[model samples]
Target: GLKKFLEDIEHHFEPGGKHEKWFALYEAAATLFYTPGLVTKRSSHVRDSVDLKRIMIMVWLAVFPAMFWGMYNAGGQAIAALNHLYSGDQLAAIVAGNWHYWLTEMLGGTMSSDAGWGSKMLLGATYFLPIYATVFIVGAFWEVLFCMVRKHEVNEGFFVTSILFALIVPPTLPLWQAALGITFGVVVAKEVFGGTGRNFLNPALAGRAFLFFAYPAQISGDLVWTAADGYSGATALSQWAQGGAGALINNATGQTITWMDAFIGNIPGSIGEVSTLALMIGAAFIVYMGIASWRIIGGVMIGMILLSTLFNVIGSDTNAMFNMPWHWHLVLGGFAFGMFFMATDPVSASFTNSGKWAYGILIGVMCVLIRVVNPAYPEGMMLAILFANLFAPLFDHVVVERNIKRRLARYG
Candidate 1:
């Protein structure tokens, strides 16, 4: 009957079954795609219905807004830049008038005169989608290979890692480069550490760091940010690093990127990290769901505020970076997004309550110090987080030891 049929199906995946060697792969697919009514005979003393897969899915939900806006903004930039570069070309005008043009304008953006909604989106899609697809597909290949070899269930966490990696990179990054970065990130940074929660570093950031150092010309400098031929401009942070706060002018347009522009994400930078407002929406959802560590976020904000204010007061005569206000630091580069998503990863961040605060502060301080002190690397979010990841275990150990001593003293 039905009971026998179920037993037969289960038997086929058991040790002696024809497909026993690939049981993990089949089980993961079955469990994730459907609810098999089969119940385990063994029972745990304590059980929580929550699971890693569900948690990962929730995190992905939080990332959706940033990803959507990233696409729109990347598309908008391509359209605007292309329109200006090829002003007389009717084809350029047609592309500029695409869906992204109206969408950006509707969102209060000053669209280009030649912008078409379809063309803008298509251009953006050309860069953003290919990068995302390349990362996802290539990363998945390695993940599946490792899972099959190691005989474990495929971790859904890679889904988040792949997208996060794509978001952090430049929109102009080559597809082959995207493939190489994700490969190094998955195999070297992640899989080598035994996959998922066992990894000490954030795989996505490690991947970005890999590219930053290995392919500086592709990932950094003024030329990689925009798509138009011969068009180039420095990021606000880069501009400040070069001159002083007074240097925050767009070289191409000969205008300043005001605090409000950076805050609203009108300034050009990474695809997703541009808009503080969109990131805040995602942050709110993450915080509301309690998926992120509030202590980490709070600690990072406090640390940045404290240090940036001190820098402002001590104002460097030669360094323009010191002139940046605390508010500007919060909105600049990938700080906001990094604080919410990257730093809060349960595996890579400090696990203890007290340790989380310390971990967050370390990252914040390093982010500012690296940006201000080191002219070579304008953005500090990735390095700071990775640096903090190295010390997270130490932070946890110190906090745990203190607690142990306190408990011993109380008993004595």
Candidate 2:
């Protein structure tokens, strides 16, 4: 009965109907239950996701492994850091104030190490849900409004963008900042370029990069990572960038850190980028489902391996990044995370297979160069992928031109 009611009223939202502008919103709900009214007529988009909405479900599920584990790690780290910093009773006083902390506390989350792993993950969820919520609402409004004004279809791509954007930022950032960040990403970076399929830049990263400049490096350091306020510590990347691999101390607790901890994501950093293991799991799923490009992934690793090994052989005395190995590079910073998620964003990435290799290699090369040479910026992966996106169209153009020239030589 409900479906029939929707079908009968659908014409009311069509061309001469009483609610013509409501078509996009109506289509938004209708398409959720049915396939889109219009499919891709143009071959401009090459990613496997264009056909059915089914692919979106897979892409969404792929984000969960990272998402849950990310929440878990962040929650646990906050507990660890707080426990290490203050004594009993004083714990409640230092919390970054209100909302999630209170929610977390109710969920058996406390500043004590006695809290269970499950409690920690639950606490992590408290922090993540708000930012994810903020981005979702803000980005959706712009996307739907643009669809209404431009008569474009309202789709769920912005939902994916919201989730991705939420993951890359520090957990403790103001919800307003998070909202504004996504607003730029959705409206300025995406909608202005004619919505999702046309945007050359990764919308999440575009917002992320905007937030990066809007704030400062302090946004990424120890202070902002954990939800607790007035607490500060140097992140592992900060420690390593200035002091090499020596001692590998946790600036927060003064504990000796190790590569294993980094691999398991015990370090302080961006909410999702903290856990390389979770990303690896997500990367495996995306590749297995044929969502992300393995050639791009392979090319990035190969580029980083070759370049970092060369630097290792040369062994710089003054520069500490020279001593870092490929494994460390894979686990640390945004290298692995961005290589899978952002660099392989099908539209911004090289369209052709051959071009993808060049694209990924260049992303890797520029990432290492910026991180090592310019130690001031350890999260060079963000800029590196953004750099590659600009040249991605050029790479595709060159490859196409080469093939066309070869065909002309043979026949014309």
Candidate 3:
């Protein structure tokens, strides 16, 4: 009877109905949180129960591993920094009268050591959730506004975009800046380009780039990576870029960091760029679900390996970057994460089968080149991916034209 009630009155929100103006809001809420429509008009030759909402949800699931690990690492770093800065008494008093004291206790650890899993997660939640909520609320506001004005259905793409943007920045980023970044990302980079599927550049990376260039102090430097006040340390890529392998020391352990440490992702970096292991776990799931392109990932790996190997073979006596191994490039910085997630973005990436390889290889080579040759920018994945996005259409065009020429020549 309740199902029948909703079904019978569903038309009241359709075109020419009393609530027609706000139909997108109603429909989006219904479709996302509740249930799909019962009506199916025309039958298709190929159809399934899958929808955009479900696909987005699946992608989020695939992203969970890296997200969780990133938070855990951030919390550990914060707690460790706090311990370094203050005595035990100072630490307890710091948390004693605080409004978040109850939360701190409930999470089951002190400021001296966030050893418990729950404590680490709760501490991380304090940073990650706020950033995520801010981006989602601000970005979704524009999305809803655009849908209302244009009379178009709301898209699920922003859901992925918000999360990606949140993961790619410093946890200490001001909420207002986060809002500003997402606004530029959604409105200028994405919506201006016709939204979601039509945008040639990756919206998340675009927003990150905006923040990177607009406010370099907040996003980069030794100060911004960790959440603890006054704590400063360089990321692995930064260390290597500025001083090479001898400088790859872990500040926390006061020891030279190894390739294994980089691979395990304990070093400082952008929120989700830490932990190659976690990123790979997420990548495996994404690939398994067929949400990402294997060809693209393979191309990126091969390109990075081949180029890095070439640099190693022709090693320079003064440049230690030339001596770094190819496998090290795979684990450092954003190379792995970008190769699997950012580069495989279906819409902005190359369309033709052959173009995928070219696009991935281009990004990989640019990433290595920028990181190795350009000391001004220690990270290269963001710029490389964005640069490759601009040429994706060209890659596709070449592939399609070549195929056409080959067929015509055979026929002639």
Full-model lDDT for every candidate: 0.81, 0.81, 0.83
Q: Which ten residues in a row have the lowest lDDT in candidate 3?
A: 95-104
Q: Which candidate would rank higher by TM-score, 1 or 3? A: 3
TM-score of each: 0.88, 0.92, 0.92
Clash number for model 1?
Answer: 13
Which residue runs of candidate 2 sit more than 4 Å off their true CA positions?
36-52, 95-97, 251-254
Please, what are the lDDT tens digits per residue for candidate 3 over residues 109-198?
A: 556553676676677778889899999999999998888887788978898999988999987898999999999989988887767787
Off by over 4 Å in 1: 1-22, 36-46, 89-112, 116-118, 251-255, 410-412
174, model 3: CA deviation in Å? 0.8
The TM-score measured for candidate 3 stands at 0.92
Q: Which candidate is the best by lDDT?
A: 3
Whole-model lDDT, candidate 1?
0.81
Candidate 2 residue-wise lDDT, 157-226, digit = tens: 7767888899888878888899889999888888888886888998888888898888875466667877
What is the alpha-carbon RMSD of candidate 1 to the true structure? 4.6
Better of 1 and 2 by TM-score: 2
Please list the residue runs of candidate 3 whose C-alpha ends up more than 4 Å from where it truly belongs after superposition: 1-12, 15-18, 33-43, 89-108, 410-412
Lowest lDDT block of 10, candidate 2: 45-54
